[PDB]
């Protein structure tokens, strides 16, 4: 991936980190069946006001080395291609070719 | 003990260049202090020069400046020794800048004198007791102002006895102004503790530790100070914290110069235990036993 | 009894007392007066700083004696530092000026 | 009782660790329960090995996390400092739990 | 009307002082001159003082000081010793357990990473606690004292801030 994309991702992450407490609270408020209608409405509107990049469902998991969006693995934080390389080199602990 | 009298972080590591607990067993990083050890990292004689301090919950006046004959606080606050001790041992109250009432500044007050005054002058009125009150008196004692007054009093009188009584009071009043000694430094607020190496804890031949007398004195002052902090947390009533602060006052006064107060405390069995001033004074203090006369190598008999 | 260099006490770094404990003879107070009464000044200085108390002074002395030097680096008695810690452990502030 | 959960990727290493722990236990205290082997986690992964395209081209890796359950029935005073100076070999996550 | 007073005993023999005091009351049968005898206790303040509901005659004063292992009353003077208060009894009645209440049903000592374990098998040392299970009263202190450096489920009371 590009540098720019990576930067964007980072920014998104930062935003998420920032706005988590508020956003979560808002969500809770919206959910809460034992609450006022007007309040709920306000909460809904409030959420809209907050930045979009603040959402965690905005940020894509990219490879930590290359930034490749596809072929990702969570345990390693790496795209398949890089993961394989790591494995070959001995750089991922415990990981070896499996047969059964 | 971490962190007691013989601490690690407050003083130093028992072993030379070693964390007593476990890290640094070579000569590379002399100084690092991990959270698992709460220990400095220097020499074995480093603890002999380092001293600790005990945050005394309740103020305690020094015994060397209260009972020296003549007392330093006796001829400075123009108050008889008898009356000074009464208030100091929570047995008498002392006024401090009352206000628009019919009472002096040096004049003391008793339970009956305070009770009636309490219902009388309930507003602007101050009448404390103990070292705290004494400290205030000393703290709020314009040295310079007294000088002129005393000097003018000595030049406006002919009384022989008074002249000598006034010249001995003004001599210690102008001498305090000549130096950087404050009047509120007489009362001990931050009691200092002697280095462990200087109060050594060695076992004799066997399995028990023959402990020094100063460790008994410091351990009692710290036990009482912890009790007094807990009672001021719990808001105990007046008579409980008066006995608690009085026991702390007597504990500090017994640590500094034991036996100058009424009958000296004792551990084993009836013999009194030896305090700091008894490490200085006497035929077996430091002057006459280790500094004027020393034991000597390259010698025979 | 005779002693060149034996064990040293713990609280004040001076030699131990007695014969069973391998100790040195007490150079008492009246002997200090009797050396003030002559003009012997270096004899008394090594008699109460080098030979007795100062630990770095006496290790410098032992190296200098086994190398033929015959010279003392004086320093301070460590028991005077013990006097400073005992007076300082009161409310008294003793120091060393300059 | 002190339950001890050893976890590692290398099995030999884990075994070595376990033995060491047992040794530590047995000198100080008494009645070590024993080194009980729990099931191994074989966390598998498939990945495409081509840079671009070839889907049948694949490598199947795995990480074998081994478990060793060591238990100590009587915790004495001394037993607590048996393994204090003896930290175990690297690449072996231990997990002691009293009661 | 019987007012309260404070008695000092040899600290450590306090329950035996309280029992001997009740027995001296029922010996010298001044039953109308004593109400109760309090030694309060938390899951022990006050450390060495015995509270007595009493009146003040010199006979009852000699009675309480003739009870063995009792030093004396604590007051302004020894002629007429001092009762304590009554305005601080109303607030003490509403609350009598400030050092062991359910106000904080979780953290008893700041975990953070500076605690020492001494209760139970593991004892005397210290470790860093990352996560904690206050709800189920559990701690994940990675104390490196006993063993390598793994989190050992410890008890709040077992550990010490
Ligand atoms: Zn260390």
Curated annotation (Swiss-Prot), chain C:
The RNAP catalytic core consists of 2 alpha, 1 beta, 1 beta' and 1 omega subunit. When a sigma factor is associated with the core the holoenzyme is formed, which can initiate transcription. Belongs to the RNA polymerase beta chain family. DNA-dependent RNA polymerase catalyzes the transcription of DNA into RNA using the four ribonucleoside triphosphates as substrates. This is DNA-directed RNA polymerase subunit beta. The gene is rpoB.
């Amino acid at each position: 991936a590009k540098q720019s994309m990576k930067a964007r991702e980072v920014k998104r992450v930062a935003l998420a980190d920032k706005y988590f407490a508020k956003r979560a609270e808002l969500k809770a408020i919206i959910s809460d069946v034992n609450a006022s209608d007007e309040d709920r409405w306000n909460a809904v509107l409030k959420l809209q006001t907050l930045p979009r990049d603040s959402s965690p469902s905005r940020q894509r998991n990219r490879c930590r080395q290359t930034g490749r969006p596809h072929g990702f693995l969570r345990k390693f934080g790496l795209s398949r291609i890089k993961v394989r390389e790591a494995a070959m080199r001995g750089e991922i602990p415990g990981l070896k070719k499996a047969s059964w | 003990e971490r962190d007691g009298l013989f601490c690690a972080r407050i003083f130093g590591p028992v072993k030379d260049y070693e964390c007593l607990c476990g890290k640094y067993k070579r000569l590379k990083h002399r100084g690092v202090i991990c959270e698992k050890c709460g220990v400095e990292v220097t020499q074995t004689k480093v603890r002999r020069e380092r001293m600790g301090h005990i945050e005394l919950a309740s103020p305690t006046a020094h015994i060397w400046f209260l009972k020296s004959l003549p007392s330093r606080i006796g001829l400075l606050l123009d108050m008889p020794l008898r009356d000074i001790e009464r208030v100091l041992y929570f047995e008498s109250y002392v006024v401090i800048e009352g206000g628009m009432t019919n009472l002096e500044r040096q004049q003391i007050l008793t339970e009956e004198q305070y009770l009636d005054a309490l219902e009388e002058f309930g507003d602007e009125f101050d009448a404390k007791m103990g070292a705290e009150a004494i400290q205030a008196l000393l703290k709020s004692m314009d040295l310079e102002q007294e000088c002129e007054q005393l000097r003018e009093e000595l030049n406006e009188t002919n009384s022989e006895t008074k002249r000598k009584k006034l010249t001995k009071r003004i001599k210690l009043l102008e001498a305090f102004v000549q130096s950087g000694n404050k009047p509120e430094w007489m009362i001990l607020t931050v009691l200092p503790v002697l280095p462990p190496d200087l109060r050594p804890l060695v076992p004799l031949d066997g399995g028990r530790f023959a402990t020094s007398d100063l460790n008994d004195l410091y351990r009692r002052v710290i036990n009482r100070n912890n009790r007094l902090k807990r009672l001021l947390d719990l808001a105990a009533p007046d008579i409980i914290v008066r006995n608690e602060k009085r026991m702390l006052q007597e504990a500090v006064d017994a640590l500094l110069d034991n036996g100058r107060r009424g009958r000296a405390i004792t551990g084993s069995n009836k013999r009194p235990l030896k305090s700091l001033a008894d490490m200085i004074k006497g035929k077996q203090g430091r002057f006459r036993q280790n500094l004027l006369g020393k034991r000597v190598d390259y010698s025979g008999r | 009894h005779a002693r060149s260099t034996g064990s040293y006490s713990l609280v004040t770094q001076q030699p131990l007392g007695g014969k069973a404990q391998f100790g040195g003879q007490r150079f008492g107070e009246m002997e200090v007066w009797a050396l003030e009464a002559y003009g012997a000044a270096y004899t008394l200085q090594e008699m109460l700083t080098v030979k007795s108390d100062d630990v770095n002074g006496r290790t410098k002395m032992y190296k200098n004696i086994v190398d033929g030097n015959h010279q003392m680096e004086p320093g301070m008695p460590e028991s005077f530092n013990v006097l400073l810690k005992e007076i300082r452990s009161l409310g008294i502030n003793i120091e060393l000026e300059d | 009782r002190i339950r001890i959960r050893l976890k590692a990727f290398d099995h030999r290493l884990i075994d070595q660790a376990t033995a060491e722990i047992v040794e530590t236990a047995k000198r100080t205290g008494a009645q070590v329960r024993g080194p009980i082997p729990l099931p191994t986690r074989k966390e598998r992964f498939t990945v495409l090995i081509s840079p671009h395209v070839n889907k049948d081209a694949r490598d199947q890796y795995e990480i074998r996390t081994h478990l060793r359950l060591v238990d100590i029935v009587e915790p004495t005073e001394k037993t607590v400092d048996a393994l204090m100076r003896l930290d175990l070999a690297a690449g072996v996550d231990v997990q002691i739990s009293l009661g | 009307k019987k007012r309260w007073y404070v008695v000092q005993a040899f600290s450590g023999f306090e329950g035996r002082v309280a029992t001997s005091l009740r027995e001296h009351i029922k010996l010298h049968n001044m039953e109308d001159l004593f109400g109760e005898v309090m030694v309060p206790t938390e899951e022990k303040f006050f450390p060495g003082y015995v509270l007595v509901q009493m009146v003040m005659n010199d006979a009852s004063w000699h009675l309480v000081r003739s009870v063995p292992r009792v030093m004396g009353f604590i007051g302004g003077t020894s002629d007429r010793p001092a009762p304590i208060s009554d305005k601080e009894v109303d607030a003490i009645m509403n609350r009598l357990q400030q050092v062991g209440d359910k106000p904080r049903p979780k953290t008893l000592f700041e975990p953070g990473e500076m605690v020492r374990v001494n209760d139970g098998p593991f004892a005397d040392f210290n470790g860093v606690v990352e996560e904690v299970d206050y709800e189920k009263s559990r701690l994940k202190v990675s104390v490196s004292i006993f063993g390598r450096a793994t989190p050992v489920e410890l008890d709040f009371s077992q550990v010490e801030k």
